[PDB]
C-alpha cells in the first residue's frame, strides 16, 4: 500500500543519467556505423580478423538498438512500462550479444595465435571465418535461449504508480521455480562465458607475446653474428680463427635462412662461406679473407633488404595484437562489475543495508559501464590503426 509518482528520481540526477546514456548511445551508434562503412566500402580491409571486427560491430549495434534505450527508459520510469515481449527481447538480445562478443574475441585470439606462434599453418579463409561466425551465433542462441523462452512480467500489489491514473507496478524478472536453478545457471554461464574465455585469452595472448618477441631476438642475433665475424676474418692473423669465424657465420646463415628469393640469397651466402672454408682448410688465410670480403657484397645486396623487411612485419604485427589485447581487457574490465555484483548479491550473504546500497548506487553504475563498453571498441580500433583514421576522414569529408 504505497503510492509512487510516475517519475522517481530527482530531476537533476535523472537529467545527468539520461544525458550520460544518450552520450554513450550516440558514441556507440557513430562508431559502429563508421566501422561498418569502413569495412564494407574498402575491399582491401576484408580479412578474417576484420570480419570478426565487423561481427563485433553488429553485436554492439544490436546492444545499442535493443538494449540501451530500453534500459534507460526502464531506469527513468517506475517499474517496466513496456510489455513482457519488449523486456524478453531486450534481455535475450543483451545475452546473445554478450556471448557473441566473447566468442568472437576468442576466435580472433585463436586466429592470431595461429598466425604468430605457428605461422607455417595455412591462413584461415573468409568462408571459414563466416561459418565460424555462424556457429558462434548458433552457440549463443542455444546457450541463452532459456532466458527468453522462460520469462514473464509480474505485478506487485504493494506499490501502485500514479501520475491521475493509479495502477499497480509491473516488473519483469526471471521467474525460476527456485533460486537454486537460477544460481546454478548464472554460475555456469559465468564460468563458460566470462572466466574460462578470460583465462584462455590472457594465457594465449601472453604466449603470443613470448613467441613474437623471440622471433625478432634471434633474427638480430644471427644478423650480428654474421656481421661481427666478418670483421674478425678481416682482422684475423692466422687460419685457425678464420675457420672458427667462418664456422660461426655458417651456422648463423643456416639459422637465418630457416627463419620465416630470400632463401636463394642465403644459398649464395652459404656457398661463399664454404668457398672461404676450403681456402682456410688449405692453410693460407690471405685468399680466404679475400673470399670472405666478397660476402659483404651479397650481404648488402641480398640480406640487408631481407633483414629490414623481416623486421618490418614483426613490429607491425605487435600493434594489432596489442589492440586486440586492449579491447579484450577493456571488455573484461567493463563486465567485471556486473558479474562480481551478481556474485556478491548471490553468494556473499551481506547485510540488508549492503544489498540496499548495492541496488541503488552500484547496479546502475555497473550496468552503465557494461553498456558503455559497446562504445569503446570503435575508439580503440580508430586510435590503434592508421587505416581506420583514413576511413574516418574519408567518411566525414564525404558526408560533411
Amino acid at each position, epitope marked *: 500500500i504505497t503510492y509512487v509518482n510516475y517519475y522517481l528520481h530527482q530531476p537533476q540526477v535523472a537529467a545527468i543519467f539520461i544525458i550520460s546514456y544518450f552520450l554513450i548511445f550516440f558514441l556507440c551508434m557513430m562508431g559502429n556505423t563508421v566501422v561498418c562503412f569502413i569495412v564494407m566500402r574498402n575491399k582491401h580491409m576484408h580479412t578474417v580478423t576484420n570480419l570478426f571486427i565487423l561481427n563485433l560491430a553488429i553485436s554492439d549495434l544490436l546492444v545499442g538498438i535493443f538494449c540501451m534505450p530500453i534500459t534507460l527508459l526502464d531506469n527513468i520510469i517506475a517499474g517496466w512500462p513496456f510489455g513482457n515481449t519488449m523486456c524478453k527481447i531486450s534481455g535475450l538480445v543483451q545475452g546473445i550479444s554478450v556471448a557473441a562478443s566473447v566468442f568472437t574475441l576468442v576466435a580472433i585470439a585463436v586466429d592470431r595465435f595461429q598466425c604468430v606462434v605457428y605461422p607455417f599453418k595455412p591462413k584461415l579463409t573468409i568462408k571459414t571465418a563466416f561459418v565460424i561466425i555462424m556457429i558462434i551465433w548458433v552457440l549463443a542462441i542455444t546457450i541463452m535461449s532459456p532466458s527468453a523462452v522462460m520469462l514473464h512480467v509480474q505485478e506487485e500489489k504493494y506499490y501502485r504508480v500514479r501520475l491521475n491514473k493509479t495502477s499497480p507496478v509491473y516488473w519483469c524478472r526471471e521467474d525460476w521455480p527456485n533460486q537454486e536453478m537460477r544460481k546454478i545457471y548464472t554460475t555456469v554461464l559465468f564460468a563458460n562465458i566470462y572466466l574460462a574465455p578470460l583465462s584462455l585469452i590472457v594465457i594465449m595472448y601472453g604466449r603470443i607475446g613470448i613467441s613474437a618477441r623471440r622471433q625478432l631476438a634471434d633474427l638480430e642475433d644471427n644478423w650480428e653474428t654474421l656481421n661481427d665475424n666478418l670483421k674478425v676474418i678481416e682482422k684475423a692473423d692466422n687460419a685457425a680463427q678464420v675457420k672458427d669465424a667462418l*664456422t*660461426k657465420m655458417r*651456422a648463423a646463415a*643456416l639459422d637465418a635462412q*630457416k627463419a620465416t628469393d630470400f632463401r636463394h640469397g642465403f644459398d649464395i651466402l652459404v*656457398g661463399q662461406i664454404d668457398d672461404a*672454408l*676450403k681456402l682456410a*682448410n688449405e692453410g693460407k688465410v690471405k685468399e680466404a679473407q679475400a673470399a670472405a670480403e666478397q660476402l659483404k657484397t651479397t650481404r648488402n645486396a641480398y640480406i640487408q633488404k631481407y633483414l629490414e623487411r623481416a623486421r618490418s612485419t614483426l613490429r607491425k604485427k605487435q600493434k594489432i595484437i596489442k589492440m586486440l589485447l586492449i579491447v579484450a581487457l577493456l571488455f573484461i574490465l567493463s563486465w567485471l562489475p556486473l558479474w562480481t555484483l551478481m556474485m556478491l548479491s548471490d553468494y556473499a550473504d551481506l547485510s540488508p543495508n549492503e544489498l540496499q546500497i548495492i541496488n541503488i548506487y552500484i547496479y546502475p553504475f555497473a550496468h552503465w559501464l557494461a553498456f558503455g563498453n559497446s562504445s569503446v571498441n570503435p575508439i580503440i580500433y580508430g586510435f590503434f590503426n592508421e587505416n581506420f583514421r583514413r576511413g574516418f576522414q574519408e567518411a566525414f569529408q564525404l558526408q560533411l
Partner: antibody, heavy 124, light 109 residues
Framework: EVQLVESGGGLVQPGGSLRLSCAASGFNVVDFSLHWVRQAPGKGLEWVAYISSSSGSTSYADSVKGRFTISADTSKNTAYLQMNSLRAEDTAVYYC?????????????????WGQGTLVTVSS | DIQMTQSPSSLSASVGDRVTITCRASQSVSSAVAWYQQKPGKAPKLLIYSASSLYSGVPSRFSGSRSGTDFTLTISSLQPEDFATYYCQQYLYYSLVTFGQGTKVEIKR
C-alpha cells in the same frame, strides 16, 4: 639403387701401407661427396676424411693428417683412401658414406647411404 | 672441435616405452644434426636429418627436435627391433663432423 662397397681392408704391420677402395653404384661420384668414417672395435664412429671430386677438395681428421691421402677416380666411379705409416690405433672398420652438395636436400641429408664397411687390423 | 655430448649412454627400456636421447653441442650450430642407428655388426642407418625431419623409409616412431643447442631424439613406442646403438652427428661443414658417444638401448629386465 645406389650402393657403396668397401674393399681392400686387411691385416697390415704397423707402419705399413694399405689402400681402401669405395666403389659407388647407382649414383655418380661427381654429384656427391665421399666421406670415410672409421669405428674402432668397441668404440664409436669418428670421421676420417672426405673428398669432393667436383671441386677436388679433400680434408682429413687431425689424427690422420699427413698419413692418409684420399683420391677419387670418376672414370671407375670409385674413391680411394691410401693409409700409410699405419699405427696400432688405426685398426677399425672403415665405412664409405655419401653426402650430397649444397644447397637443398642432398646436403641436408647427411650420410644417408653408407657402405658395408671393411675392417683393417694393424698389428705386428 | 664442435664437441657433441650424448649423455644418456645407458638406456634400459622395455617394448612399448617412450625413450628419449639428448645431445648437446658446444657451438650454436643450426638444425644441422643427424641421428643414426647402428645394430652390432652392421653399418649405421640414417634415422633423422636436419634435427627434425624423418628420413624416408624409417618408422615414424622416431622423432627428433631442437631447442637451443639441445637436440633430442625420441622413440614413442620402442619396438623390439629398436634396440641398437644411436649416434648423434653434427654436420655443419664437410670437414667439421663430430659424432656423439653413442647410446646403447638395452632390454629392461
Amino acid at each position: 639403387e645406389v650402393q657403396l662397397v668397401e674393399s681392400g681392408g686387411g691385416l697390415v704391420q704397423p707402419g705399413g701401407s694399405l689402400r681402401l677402395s669405395c666403389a659407388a653404384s647407382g649414383f655418380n661420384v661427381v654429384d656427391f661427396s665421399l666421406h670415410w668414417v672409421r669405428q674402432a672395435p668397441g668404440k664409436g664412429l669418428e670421421w676420417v676424411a672426405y673428398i669432393s671430386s667436383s671441386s677436388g677438395s679433400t680434408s682429413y681428421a687431425d689424427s690422420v693428417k699427413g698419413r692418409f691421402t684420399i683420391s677419387a677416380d670418376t672414370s671407375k666411379n670409385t674413391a680411394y683412401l691410401q693409409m700409410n705409416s699405419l699405427r696400432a690405433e688405426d685398426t677399425a672398420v672403415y665405412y664409405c658414406a655419401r653426402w650430397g652438395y649444397w644447397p637443398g636436400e642432398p646436403w641436408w641429408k647427411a650420410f644417408d647411404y653408407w657402405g658395408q664397411g671393411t675392417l683393417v687390423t694393424v698389428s705386428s | 672441435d664442435i664437441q657433441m655430448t650424448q649423455s644418456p649412454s645407458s638406456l634400459s627400456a622395455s617394448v612399448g616405452d617412450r625413450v628419449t636421447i639428448t645431445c648437446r653441442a658446444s657451438q650454436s650450430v643450426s638444425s644441422a644434426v643427424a641421428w643414426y642407428q647402428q645394430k652390432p655388426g652392421k653399418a649405421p642407418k640414417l634415422l633423422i636429418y636436419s634435427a627434425s625431419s624423418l628420413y624416408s623409409g624409417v618408422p615414424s616412431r622416431f622423432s627428433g627436435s631442437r631447442s637451443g643447442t639441445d637436440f633430442t631424439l625420441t622413440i614413442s613406442s620402442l619396438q623390439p627391433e629398436d634396440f641398437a646403438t644411436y649416434y648423434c652427428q653434427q654436420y655443419l661443414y664437410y670437414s667439421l663432423v663430430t659424432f656423439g658417444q653413442g647410446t646403447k638401448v638395452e632390454i629392461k629386465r
